[PDB]
Symmetry: D3
Subunit: 149 residues, 6 copies
Amino acid sequence: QDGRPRMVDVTEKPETFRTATAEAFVELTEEALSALEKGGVGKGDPLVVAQLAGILAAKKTADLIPLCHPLPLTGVEVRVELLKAEKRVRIEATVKTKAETGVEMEAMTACAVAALTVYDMLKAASKGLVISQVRLLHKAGGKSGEWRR
Amino acid sequence: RPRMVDVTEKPETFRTATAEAFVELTEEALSALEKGGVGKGDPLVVAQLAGILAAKKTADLIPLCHPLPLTGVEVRVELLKAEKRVRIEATVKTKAETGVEMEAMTACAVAALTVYDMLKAASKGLVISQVRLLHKAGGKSGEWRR
Amino acid sequence: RPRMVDVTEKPETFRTATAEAFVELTEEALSALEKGGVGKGDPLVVAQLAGILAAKKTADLIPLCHPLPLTGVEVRVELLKAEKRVRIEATVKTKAETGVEMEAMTACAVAALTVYDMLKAASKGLVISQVRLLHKAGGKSGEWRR
Amino acid sequence: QDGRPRMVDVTEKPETFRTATAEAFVELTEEALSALEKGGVGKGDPLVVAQLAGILAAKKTADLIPLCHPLPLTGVEVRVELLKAEKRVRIEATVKTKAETGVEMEAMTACAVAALTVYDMLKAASKGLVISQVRLLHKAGGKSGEWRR
Amino acid sequence: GRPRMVDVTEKPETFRTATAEAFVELTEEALSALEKGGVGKGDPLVVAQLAGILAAKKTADLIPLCHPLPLTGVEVRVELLKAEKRVRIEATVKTKAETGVEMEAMTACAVAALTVYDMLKAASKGLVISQVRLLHKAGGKSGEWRR
Amino acid sequence: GRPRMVDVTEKPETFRTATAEAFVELTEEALSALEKGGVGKGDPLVVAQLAGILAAKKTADLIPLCHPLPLTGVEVRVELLKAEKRVRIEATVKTKAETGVEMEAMTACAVAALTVYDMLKAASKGLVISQVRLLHKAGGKSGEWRR
Ligand SMILES: Nc1nc2c(ncn2[C@@H]2O[C@H](COP(=O)(O)OP(=O)(O)OP(=O)(O)O)[C@@H](O)[C@H]2O)c(=O)[nH]1
Ligand SMILES: Nc1nc2c(ncn2[C@@H]2O[C@H](COP(=O)(O)OP(=O)(O)OP(=O)(O)O)[C@@H](O)[C@H]2O)c(=O)[nH]1
Ligand SMILES: Nc1nc2c(ncn2[C@@H]2O[C@H](COP(=O)(O)OP(=O)(O)OP(=O)(O)O)[C@@H](O)[C@H]2O)c(=O)[nH]1
Ligand SMILES: Nc1nc2c(ncn2[C@@H]2O[C@H](COP(=O)(O)OP(=O)(O)OP(=O)(O)O)[C@@H](O)[C@H]2O)c(=O)[nH]1
Ligand SMILES: Nc1nc2c(ncn2[C@@H]2O[C@H](COP(=O)(O)OP(=O)(O)OP(=O)(O)O)[C@@H](O)[C@H]2O)c(=O)[nH]1
Ligand SMILES: Nc1nc2c(ncn2[C@@H]2O[C@H](COP(=O)(O)OP(=O)(O)OP(=O)(O)O)[C@@H](O)[C@H]2O)c(=O)[nH]1
């Protein structure tokens, strides 16, 4: 019984309210930005589709992250705004639940997939786009307690 | 209006894509990682496999993305001690009417998310940064690089 | 803005939902079905199982739908010769902050789609009609019926 | 080797261009209609979300329909309009591909799930809503050839 | 030494085929339940035969380094062998691609077996899935292979 | 007689646990490949052990009448037994719910085995998955059960 892959046993940990908020950014290029403001490259609105994709991702997290716990989610929010001046798209997501485990991954993942979704909705205009700074901003509940960046 | 771009008209040509991602480590992260993980298993070994799997699940995560038959997938996950970084690279190949830039980008992203998952117990200040396309080729498009 | 409705605040109460669907048959469909299918297997046996499975996959099909632990699923698939109809009914139960009307509606819909798949070789004029909620109960909501 | 469930062998059938178009309707009630025109019951725009859900469904078809063939899809279109006067929401989808098998199910399924999605986006306003007349409108390619309702 | 999905880009898409089987040893209690039609959960074999077909289609999702594949065909047969008190599962999967379908056929049986077990464990938790093996395969380089 | 997901609504959510194992018979060629680190696809056991964990989480998706479940824990161990020329797989799954986790544990091993097979079939297509059985289970009504 060495240090090998395993899903930590949290059977005896209580069922407390958990939450987590994350964010991701997408660095745009002129062409990219030009298209976005024109409504996309013909596939639909990048932000609208990516926003829904980010929510769906939150629900598929345990399917993408190997040692992650399957959890019923009680809430999922996702914001996908365009920071016109900075040439950036900003995604932020907040997930909530009632289980023995946290939801930092459901939050982190929601942001990464919505980021990938914006990329797919605009790579035809420019493939140099970059997804940057995907990071956690807060979480609460359980034992660790509150946390903010 | 949203929609999956019709490509029935185009032919099956070889397609290849290569991307990469970075996870910025905190000493607390790098120390755990080096001692074998935070107690959940080698963070990198798990990230790499999760990356190959993410490439296979791409079309089910990216809404307008085209379902394709992956013909090859490589994923590299390496620790850069001096840089306090985890570098991830993925190459996806296929034969179809569309590129695999998503599969590659997705493989890197999810691998990164897995590095985060295997180390966040040591630090939640970990940052996934620069998931970007390095190389791509095939069909009409042609060559392209960072 | 789209979003999965926060219910962390509410308690886990028993929840139940019952829906149904109909597939209008053409003589060409009913004749195949009665002879055992169009050659792919009992259309109804397959529809019923597909329905139970659809109930389990609901949250992955309905975007804002809440992930829940299903605690029970019943699906009935019956031929109504005189009516040239296929009647489908599904009841889903659970214990959580939200109802299972989707699971039940989804179970019926997909079962219906399966009846169509097992018979369309005989007729593509088959119609899925009236997928609707029959009964529902649990928590704040209370009773409700067609 | 009797008449039991099986995925028909189409290995020796050629790879021809296939297409299929289907449609589904959702009968609304006043409350339902009132909310839809007001932008939904708080979860987002029913038509916008259902439209994306219908596309995604098209890709999960083989996962929902037991004896259905796994196929690379080459195209997917979905229309989700509100027929204000008839108190109906009309969904229509068209799928395309290049394989030995048709895509009538990818089309039928896209419509049924988008219908379910509109239901979920409005059941809070009225649960009496009904999904009706999900049917095929056309298909082409392969052997059967053209077909229209 | 690291894991990966083998590059088969330059290989030609041909007719591939694989056939594997699986066995489920039945205890007397479980066999009796099977003959009565199951523990009231449903018909063990009927449900299992379907689980195998669906299974085969989810193969690439369960085997990490497996290649995703459009399947041209899937055949599954689940039978009872009273005398040996065993359930037998045979599956033949067919495709046109650069890689074989041994995994789809192999997984088809394993999961079908797992389903027999689920449908009867209420009677005997000790039931065993005894033999999941490849019987035949064909297509491409190595050509026809037989057990 | 029709199939269905058994109603367990009125049962209490308790600590459930199940442990099952699986074996993979190795031919001399395959064993040799295993000791060298595999056929160049990656480390058979490492990859398999992960496939089992993921597998267990996809259980409800593969077994038709199975109950979906939040899993509190999943343990998988994959070892080589040179002398018997066998790979052994043990999996223990844990949850808090109205139903047992025998399927999650049972499927964890079967799929892990299927993965060993995938990682080594290049060397020997004849490798066999010989024994997938339940070793222990606990929680609820029947309580502790042992092979
Ligand atoms: N400006 C420009 N637009 C393009 C080009 N190719 C396609 N488009 C537009 O963008 C859409 C295609 O999106 P892409 O991301 O390039 O390809 P895709 O196959 O749709 O998406 P994936 O399956 O995720 O790879 C088309 O329907 C057009 O609306 C191009 O070369 N230049
Ligand atoms: N260094 C360190 N390790 C911890 C700490 N808390 C838990 N661990 C270790 O890491 C494991 C928990 O991993 P987490 O990612 O925090 O939680 P998890 O539920 O296992 O993982 P998720 O389901 O992905 O959220 C424990 O079983 C220990 O092995 C901590 O505060 N510091
Ligand atoms: N008018 C009205 N609106 C409600 C009621 N309950 C919830 N809502 C609104 O509708 C949203 C909830 O949608 P519902 O479909 O009822 O429940 P849900 O859990 O979000 O959706 P499912 O997980 O698919 O069952 C809330 O966020 C509010 O915006 C209600 O009782 N009356
Ligand atoms: N009565 C009748 N049966 C047909 C016809 N064509 C095919 N069949 C039978 O039905 C099977 C084909 O089913 P289809 O649904 O048309 O095609 P499929 O590829 O098997 O099914 P999908 O993947 O869901 O599209 C054949 O293998 C025969 O068993 C037809 O024109 N009339
Ligand atoms: N010794 C031996 N090695 C082989 C043979 N064929 C392929 N290999 C090696 O094993 C790898 C191929 O693995 P396989 O499992 O046969 O095929 P695969 O397509 O990669 O795997 P699947 O998609 O799961 O079928 C090659 O990249 C080589 O490293 C063979 O016939 N004999
Ligand atoms: N003979 C016998 N039958 C049982 C027992 N427990 C349950 N049953 C019967 O089998 C059904 C339960 O099936 P199980 O497989 O034990 O449990 P399950 O939760 O339905 O199935 P899973 O979700 O796959 O674990 C009940 O509805 C009864 O029909 C038992 O202990 N002995």
